[PDB]
Design a protein around this ligand. Structure first.
Ligand code: HEM
Ligand code: HEM
Lengths: 149, 149
């Protein structure tokens, strides 16, 4: 039941289109808010420079490049949620970076709150809905499993 | 006095030539021994997979790629120790990865012991000497400062 309905896939694709024209900005907004709200990430991300604010980090090539990388895994999963197992072997080595010992498990929940917040910011008020909220949350759950397992 | 004598530069260049034909193997030998002797590096290197031995990690593309990266910084410094400040801005972002909080400071000493051990393994017994030992140790000290400061 790690499967989304066809209607959930479709609601997601409809927000992916809204996000596509500014997709890189969207993903950097997410990582910047995540780092603002969870300051311990400046010790977990090796490239993060603890003498700078998240917003100062946003200019750094290593912030941009980490956002582009997670941005790609998320994009590839969102666009075909049920067929996500095709990405299995290219993913593969993510598991070892995301163990409980390296990444405190409650940070996954936090990062999903940040994705949902930036999604709400880019989607129109008229289009956002409870059903979309549940489709994105379920989607985030599947992406989570791919990156940890 | 972060400066090596011309004679120390020259003793180093003479070992760099011995290492060049197998340089990548040499640097992977170093990282593999470092990870065998200091098991906590499997929590510090994010890509390291704690369910595997260092030697099993050696096959992984992320082990090979991390060894190639440190291998390049070391090579570039060794070949012109006194003029190392030319590399300053390409280095730059290494500092934030190597703070005391992210990397326990006594591990620098450990990693330098591993470089010296693999250097002794590749250099002939007839050529290795006390003066070379001191030239490499001093060289390692300068490379250390470049990567932390
Ligand atoms: C399901 C959500 C997540 C996705 C899709 C994701 C994606 C990725 C990807 C693709 C990489 C490898 C990037 C590269 O090769 O440079 C990565 C690395 C990493 N991630 Fe995640 N990640 C997620 C959750 C988290 C969380 C919550 C944290 C907490 C800080 C986190 C921390 C890390 C760390 C420490 C690494 C090695 C990171 C790095 O090397 O900068 N990840 N992630
Ligand atoms: C003077 C000796 C050292 C040199 C020349 C060196 C070199 C480098 C380089 C060039 C990088 C960036 C590679 C990249 O962009 O992917 C790096 C990252 C890193 N280094 Fe070092 N390093 C040294 C000492 C250490 C020590 C003793 C440790 C202890 C574990 C260490 C742990 C790390 C960590 C956690 C990172 C981020 C590493 C990674 O992202 O895998 N380094 N180092």
């Amino acid at each position: 039941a790690m499967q989304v309905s066809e209607e959930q896939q479709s609601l997601i694709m409809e927000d992916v289109q809204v996000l596509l024209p500014n997709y890189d900005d969207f993903v950097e907004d997410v990582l910047q808010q995540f780092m603002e709200e969870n300051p311990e990430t400046f010790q977990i991300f090796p490239w993060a420079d603890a003498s700078k604010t998240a917003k100062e980090m946003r200019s750094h090539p290593r912030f941009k490049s980490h956002a582009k990388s997670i941005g790609k895994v998320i994009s590839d999963c969102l666009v075909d949620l049920n067929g996500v197992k095709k990405h299995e072997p290219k993913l593969s080595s993510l598991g070892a970076m995301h163990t409980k010992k390296k990444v405190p498990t409650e940070l996954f929940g936090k990062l999903g709150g940040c994705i949902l917040t930036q999604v709400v910011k880019r989607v129109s008020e008229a289009k956002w809905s409870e059903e979309k909220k549940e489709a994105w949350l379920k989607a985030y759950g599947i992406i989570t499993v791919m990156v940890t397992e």
